[PDB]
Amino acid sequence: LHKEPATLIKAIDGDTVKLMYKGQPMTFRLLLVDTPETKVEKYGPEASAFTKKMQENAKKIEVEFDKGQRTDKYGRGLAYIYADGKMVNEALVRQGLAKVAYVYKGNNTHEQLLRKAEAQAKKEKLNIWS
């Protein structure tokens, strides 16, 4: 897998973000994570504030497509998003602000890594795991 440059256009919520990718606006759905809904589940707004702050404060944003399908049915890019080298998908799970979701169409490169972060948050009874 390889990281490609991107520019934050707009944070949308925990599991979605709008980026300028290859010079065109595009909406991305973070791979392997399930964040609470804000439109308003519990920790829904926390998850959203988390990704917004992480993405807006980042100097560099990068998108990393997995080896499976790259877009969902709604035209959203399916990727791991990095902010200054740190994966937003992982940070979310680690902070207990998202659960690891089912593998989708062969996109599972980082499934174990997120599985680990999630076990740790659970053990720490962090947020959603409170």
Domain CATH code at residue 69: 2.40.50.90
Q: Is 94 marked active-site?
A: no
SS3 122: helix
Way it was determined: X-ray
Contacts 24+ apart (CB under 8 A), 13-17: 13/38, 13/39, 13/44, 13/47, 13/48, 13/51, 14/38, 14/44, 14/47, 14/48, 14/50, 14/51, 14/92, 14/97, 14/98, 15/47, 15/51, 15/98, 16/76, 17/51, 17/55, 17/81, 17/88
Q: Is 70 marked active-site?
A: no
Q: Using CA atoms, how far apart are residues 48 and 13, in angstroms rounded to an integer?
A: 4
Domain count, the chain: 1
SS3 47: helix
Classify burial at 87, counting beta carbons within 10 Å of its beta carbon; exposed 0-12, middle 13-18, buried 19 or more: buried
The number of residues in the chain equals 130
Q: Using CA atoms, how far apart are residues 86 and 23, in angstroms rounded to an integer?
A: 23
List, as residue ranges, the binding site.
15, 34-35
Token reading at 55: 């993405």
Token reading at 96: 């207990």
Q: Is 41 marked active-site?
A: no
Write down the catalytic residue from 76, 90, 94, 118.
76
Q: Using CA atoms, how far apart are residues 101 and 89, in angstroms rounded to an integer?
A: 11
Domain span at residue 52 reads 1-130
List, as residue ranges, the binding site for Ca(2+).
15, 34-35
